[PDB]
UniProtKB/Swiss-Prot annotation, chains A, B:
InterPro entries: ParD, ParD_sf, Ribbon_hlx_hlx
Species name: Escherichia coli
Disulphide-bridged cysteine pairs: none
Note: Plasmid IncP-alpha RK2 is maintained at 5-8 copies per chromosome.
Keyword field contains Phosphoprotein: no
Protein name per the record: Antitoxin ParD
Organism taxonomic ancestry: Bacteria, Pseudomonadati, Pseudomonadota, Gammaproteobacteria, Enterobacterales
């Protein structure tokens, strides 16, 4: 486990420490990713452009259903298709 | 002293850890500021300021065949992509 110890100022530590919890996690993760923050944009559009889950609730629940529709999408819009 | 301990993965920690020394300091400084980064000018300004006059191009190459993904020669009719 590559654990690094970083020295910070009591005042600043509250800025990042609080932010970590504010985001919904612990600095141990938040600060960690901050050192390696890439671009989630590229992994956002394609996240649905190739496989859109939608915004509906469950309807059966049984492991995983092989969607016959989703998977084959083409140019037409940026946000929608199946709402 | 507000010193925070963080757990990172061997391979990844080397990416940021090494960058610290590569820049001319210890990750305890480099990674530290990375947690408190706030700028939107140099991010785009320096992103292109170096895109022109690089630092290490090596007289070896010349024809270019994709490998570095960074570095171009101005004053020359080329295709799009990088414009």
């Amino acid at each position: 486990m590559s654990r690094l110890t970083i020295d910070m100022t009591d005042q600043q530590h509250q800025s990042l420490k609080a932010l970590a919890a504010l985001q919904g996690k612990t600095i141990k993760q938040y600060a960690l990713e901050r050192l390696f923050p890439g671009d989630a944009d590229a992994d956002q559009a394609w996240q649905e452009l190739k496989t859109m889950l939608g915004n509906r609730i469950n309807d059966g629940l049984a492991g995983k259903v092989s969607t016959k529709s989703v998977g084959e999408i083409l140019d037409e819009e940026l946000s929608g298709d199946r709402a």
